[model samples]
Target chain A: KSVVARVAEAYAEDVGKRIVRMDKYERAKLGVSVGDYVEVKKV
Target chain B: KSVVARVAEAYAEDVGKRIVRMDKYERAKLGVSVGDYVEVKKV
Candidate 1:
């Protein structure tokens, strides 16, 4: 898996893995569409 | 898009939508995995 995917997998739980979910209002503000992935870094 | 997909899109930006990235250390704390959709509620 890519680092991105790995980074995501690292956050899984015994019950189930969870993804960070965002909504349309937030997306329009951020300027991203469906089928796209975002990179997050620590500041 | 489903609410989860919509929620994911809500974080995009003009430069690009940013998906929250998590590393193993942090994932262990949260207990999530890659491709697992998480639901975020407004506090």
Candidate 2:
């Protein structure tokens, strides 16, 4: 929880994972909308 | 209470934050989806 999804992508490899599109908005910084993709660094 | 929306081309100025979602769902299971705004952290 220290890092958000998009930000995590910038540091994904550092976190030992690849970025994947999120199916849900866990830590949306601006609120999601239809037809939008929630990308995230994989765990 | 957080933010989520489809990512976009990096913007300029104060438009620095963004996130987005896909289609809508029941908002109960995941507490989010199209046309459904779930309360955060109350579950």
DockQ of 2: 0.06
Candidate 2 TM-score, C-alpha based: 0.19
**lDDT per residue as tens, model 2, A1-43:** 2223222122222222222223233434335432344432211
Compute each candidate's TM-score over C-alphas.
0.30, 0.19
Q: Which candidate leads in TM-score? A: 1
Q: Looking at model 1 chain A, which ten-residue stretch has the lowest summed lDDT? A: A1-10
Docking verdict class for candidate 2? incorrect
The deviation in Å at residue A22 for candidate 2 is 8.2
Tell me the chain A TM-score of model 2: 0.22
lDDT of each: 0.36, 0.29
lDDT of 2 by residue, B1-43 (tens): 2333343332232133322222222122244433332332211
Model 2 chain B weakest lDDT span, ten residues long: B20-29
Candidate 1 lDDT score relative to the true structure: 0.36
Residues B1-43, candidate 1: write the lDDT tens digits: 1112121322333223324434454445445555443333221
